[PDB]
Structures are given as C-alpha cells and as structure tokens.
Amino acid sequence: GLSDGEWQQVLNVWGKVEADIAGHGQEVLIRLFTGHPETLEKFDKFKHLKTEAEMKASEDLKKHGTVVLTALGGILKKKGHHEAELKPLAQSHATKHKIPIKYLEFISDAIIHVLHSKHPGDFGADAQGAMTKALELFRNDIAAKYKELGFQ
Ligand code: HEM
C-alpha cells in the first residue's frame, strides 16, 4: 500500500526508464544473469550466452528487456489496481516458466541497482523508498497467486 505521494515518486522515477527502455531493460537482465547465474538456466533462448560481452551484444536480450519493462511499467501505472494485468503474469511465471518468487526478489533488487548505476546522485532516498515499496507490492501480489496454485 502506497500513498499518492509515493506513487508520484514511482512514476517520476519511471520516466527515467521510459527515456531509454531498451538500455535499462538490457542492464537489468545483465545484472540478474551475472549476479545470479542460475536465473539464466530458465531461459532456453539465453542459456547459450556464456560471457557478459555476448550478453551485451545480444539484440534479442535487449528485445526481451523491452518486453519485461514494458509489462512492469503498465503494472506500475495502475497504482496498485493491477489485478487484471498481474494475473496472467503470475500464471505464466508459475505454470509455464516455473520462476520461483526468489527470482522476482532478485530482479527487484537489480532494478534498484541499475537505477543507481545509470542515474548516480539522481535516485534519491525518497525515490528509492517508493520504488522499493512498489516492487514489494508487485512481488507480494504475485506471491498470493503462487500460493493459490501451490507453486514453490
Ligand atoms: C519484473 C518482473 C518481470 C516481468 C514484468 C516479466 C514479464 C514477462 C513477460 C511480459 C513475458 C512474456 C509473456 C509471458 O510469457 O508471460 C515474460 C517471459 C518470460 N519471463 Fe518474465 N518477467 C519478470 C521477471 C522474470 C524473472 C525474474 C524471470 C527468470 C529469472 C523471468 C523469466 C521469464 C521467461 C523464462 C520468459 C519466457 C521467455 C521466452 O522464452 O521468450 N521473468 N516475462
């Protein structure tokens, strides 16, 4: 649960992402894959990537980063009223992709890391607080659907 002022911070930060969605999406995925190499094994289309240089050169990885962040941005713009947008993603991630909730924690922290890396000194303590709360809400509502499905 976020206040109006917190949502305002979230959507202000998101404007930074929307200025270069593919570059942010690329770096988020590279941070996830290099920090947590077990996550790469969930992607049949990226498992061939052995080095970060290969990851950086991959146009399909940048494409997938655009898909991921476009979906997250659509959810964030709902300011918590995201049941319809979140349900299909929870279902596909539990039943088809088999993504444990832990990996959603990993990517949440990766988003925070990339924001500081690309906007050093321009991602303030209030903005980090609000973004973290928004990603926690997203993860918690997915977790509720995972529990319904019995997925671990
Ligand atoms: C911010 C969180 C994320 C968002 C919004 C997101 C969004 C999406 C979307 C929109 C798709 C395509 C449609 C679908 O299959 O449902 C997708 C595919 C996928 N997601 Fe996620 N995702 C997230 C996190 C992750 C994480 C953490 C992993 C794994 C570590 C992951 C693994 C996958 C895989 C394996 C695919 C299928 C890729 C394919 O082969 O083309 N997702 N995701």
Swiss-Prot record:
Location in the cell: Cytoplasm, Sarcoplasm
SUPFAM superfamilies: Globin-like (SSF46458)
PROSITE patterns assigned: GLOBIN (PS01033)
This enzyme's EC code(s): 1.7.-.-, 1.11.1.-
Primary localisation category: cytoplasm
Reaction(s) this enzyme catalyzes, per UniProt: Fe(III)-heme b-[protein] + nitric oxide + H2O = Fe(II)-heme b-[protein] + nitrite + 2 H(+); H2O2 + AH2 = A + 2 H2O
Domain Globin: 1-147
Subunit structure: Monomeric.
Keyword Heme among UniProt keywords: yes
Protein name as annotated: Myoglobin
Listed GO biological process terms: oxygen transport; removal of superoxide radicals
Phosphoserine: modified positions: S3
GO cellular component, one term: sarcoplasm
